[PDB]
Structures are given as structure tokens and as C-alpha cells.
RNA sequence: GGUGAAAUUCUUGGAUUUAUUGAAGACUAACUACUGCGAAAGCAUUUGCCAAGGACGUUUUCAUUAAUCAAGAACGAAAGUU
């Protein structure tokens, strides 16, 4: 079960870049799920969805696929996000790519660990990934070190 | 910044705005109007100098010296050329 968000808390921060998989589209916008963080839903509105004039949404969004975005407002009581998509700079997307790729590696490795040990990812992340992220900022550099220095 | 909306561009070597100032070059807002001057272009900050001009007033002076003009000439917006 893929849960237990990458970061040390399940909620977003006010300015961050993130990457999102679209789940559906409504008329006012799309309330979609975050993948840089665990599962929390939030709106992306059509007015702040496309760069150019919004002529089509099917071509741009491509529901079921991965896109870059940022977060502007946060609901820190029960969980709701306001996100943005047009304000992604040419430099933003590159670092979003690298951050999501390292996160995806560290997620798939420990997902395999959970599947082979049949223990929820929450406990495994709390026991292993979190202290390593505390110590060296991200667990992937720790994995590289463990390859080199044990 | 900018735009229908964006992007290019400048920014924690702190831009955008904030106060004093300093430099440069342009130009003369509002007053500015069915208003003025000039042959036409054109002419709008102040002051001085330089000469010029229309209009009016004139019981001033000369007495046709005038009108339009091929040839010839003077100015001639903007742009452009040394
Ligand atoms: Mg300043
Ligand atoms: Mg003036
Ligand atoms: Mg006048
Ligand atoms: Mg002639
Ligand atoms: Mg010239």
C-alpha cells in the first residue's frame, strides 16, 4: 500500500513545486491528487491551468498522466489544496523532474521492501527513511553511501 | 515590467517603488478658443537687442508710379544626403 508521504509531514507548504497525476476534470476545474506528497486532493482551476489560451483541456491535461505544478494556498484542518500550473518557470520543471525521480526511486525501493515483508509502509518509513532524510536531507544519497560506505 | 492574456527583460550584488539632490539633451503641458501673426511652409517659457509688417487715425506728401504675369529669381513641412 503506497501511502505515508515522502516528506516529514503529510501536508504541503506555501510556495513549493510539486508534480501531480490528474484523476478527473470538472467544469470549474480539476480536484486532483498530489504525488510529491501522499494522497491529499486539491483544485487546479482552468484559468490557472494552461499557459496559452485554454482552447482544449483534453490535449493539455491528459488525465492519468504526470504534470508539474505549484501550490498557492493550503487547508491545514482536514486537507485541501489550491494549486497552480501556468506559473511553472522553464527552470522549475527541471528541478521538479529530478526531485520526483529521486523520490520515485526511494519510494519504489521501500514499496518493494513493504511488499516482501507485508508490513505497512508507514512503520517502515518511520523506522528507516525519516532518520536518513533528517541526517542527509534525502535518503538516496544515504543509499549511495551504503553502496560505498556502510 | 507588460499585456486581451502571456512571455522576453531587471532583481536578497537587493531591483520596483522612498526622500533629497547632481548630469545630459529634448521640449515648452495646463492657459489653448469655429482666437492671433505670417507670402506659403510655419510660429506658444521669461528678458534684452536687432531690423521688419499688417490694420486704424491723418484738412500730410508724389501724381498713375498700377493688376496679372512666359524668362528669371527668394523661401519651401517631414523624410533623405555630406
Ligand atoms: Mg531602491
Ligand atoms: Mg507654456
Ligand atoms: Mg492670441
Ligand atoms: Mg514662372
Ligand atoms: Mg532632418
Swiss-Prot record:
Signal peptide: none
Subcellular compartments: Cytoplasm, Cytosol
PTM-bearing positions, type Phosphoserine: 50
Domain S1 motif: residue ranges: 15-86
Domain of life (superkingdom): Eukaryota
Processing after translation: Phosphorylated; phosphorylation on Ser-50 by the GCN2 protein kinase occurs in response to low amino acid, carbon, or purine availability. Phosphorylation inhibits the guanine nucleotide exchange factor activity of the eIF2B complex.
Subunit annotation: Eukaryotic translation initiation factor 2 eIF2 is a heterotrimeric complex composed of an alpha, a beta and a gamma subunit. The factors eIF-1, eIF-2, eIF-3, TIF5/eIF-5 and methionyl-tRNAi form a multifactor complex (MFC) that may bind to the 40S ribosome. Interacts with CDC123; the interaction is direct. Interacts with GCD1.
Miscellaneous comment as given in the Swiss-Prot or TrEMBL entry: Present with 17100 molecules/cell in log phase SD medium.
Family: Belongs to the eIF-2-alpha family.
Job of this protein: eIF-2 functions in the early steps of protein synthesis by forming a ternary complex with GTP and initiator tRNA. This complex binds to a 40S ribosomal subunit, followed by mRNA binding to form a 43S pre-initiation complex. Junction of the 60S ribosomal subunit to form the 80S initiation complex is preceded by hydrolysis of the GTP bound to eIF-2 and release of an eIF-2-GDP binary complex. In order for eIF-2 to recycle and catalyze another round of initiation, the GDP bound to eIF-2 must exchange with GTP by way of a reaction catalyzed by eIF2B.
Protein name: Eukaryotic translation initiation factor 2 subunit alpha
Source species of the chain: Saccharomyces cerevisiae (strain ATCC 204508 / S288c)
Lineage, top ranks: Eukaryota, Fungi, Dikarya, Ascomycota, Saccharomycotina
Gene designation per UniProt: SUI2
Covered range of the whole protein: 3 to 152 of 304
